[PDB]
């Protein structure tokens, strides 16, 4: 790769500069290079990887939705062509994330935090592919997303407290999957309500170093329930 000659520590250092500069493609490239060194990522580095690629794919999703709306409201080839161009780029980024996850990041080893986070990430980027899929791809993409989320859920309930931010964020994203991709509003509402209530019931498990993240997700769970009720 293009980062092959750079030292891992310099790659991490430059990902953090790129974040400060709001250069999120660069930041994603630097973090990809870091991952390709073959060593496990720390919690801080997993955040860099997550923040970089989510920012990249987020801009592509927002663009795709704008163009898709124009495309359907006009129901010339230009809008469809340009929508397909953004769509192909988005799929290319999701393929890159999913390839890093399978080639390098997901393992049977490592602690449960890391294993859950990568399976949640795998579920997310299959979900992003599913937002733009149609046919024999779409059915199988949704199953790959649900499969990855479910394995992450099983591990998280067994190994992490109910306020853990990866656990919460995973459960929040699985439920959005249920409501938006799987069209199962009841399965979504059941997961979100259970997740929030169990977090409340074991509120004492909040961690000094992540409680702000936990309470943010709990609120986002409440917001989704209000939307869905």
């Amino acid at each position: 790769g293009a980062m092959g000659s750079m030292e891992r520590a310099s790659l991490i250092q430059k990902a953090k500069l790129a974040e400060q500069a709001e250069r999120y493609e660069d930041m994603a490239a630097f973090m990809k290079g870091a991952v390709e060194k073959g060593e496990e990522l720390s919690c801080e580095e997993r955040n860099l990887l997550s923040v970089a690629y989510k920012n990249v794919v987020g801009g592509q999703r927002a663009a795709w939705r704008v163009l898709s709306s124009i495309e359907q409201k006009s129901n010339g080839p230009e809008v469809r062509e340009y929508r397909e161009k953004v769509e192909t780029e988005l799929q290319g980024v999701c393929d890159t994330v999913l390839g890093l996850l399978d080639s390098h990041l997901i393992k049977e080893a490592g602690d449960a935090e890391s294993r859950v986070f990568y399976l949640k990430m795998k579920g997310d980027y299959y979900r992003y592919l599913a937002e733009v899929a149609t046919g024999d791809d779409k059915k199988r993409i949704i199953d790959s997303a649900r499969s990855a989320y479910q394995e992450a859920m099983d591990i998280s309930k067994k190994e992490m407290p109910p306020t853990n931010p990866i656990r919460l964020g995973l459960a929040l994203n699985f439920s959005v999957f249920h409501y938006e991709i799987a069209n199962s509003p009841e399965e979504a509402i059941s997961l979100a309500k259970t997740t929030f209530d169990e977090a409340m019931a074991d509120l004492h498990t909040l961690s000094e170093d992540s409680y702000k993240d936990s309470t943010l997700i709990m609120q986002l769970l409440r917001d989704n329930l209000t939307l869905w009720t």
């Binding site: 997310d124 994203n173 989704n224």
Partner: peptide, 10 residues
């Protein structure tokens, strides 16, 4: 109004 997923932080 769309569903809210996990945001970016930190």
């Amino acid at each position: 109004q769309r569903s809210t997923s996990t945001p970016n932080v930190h």
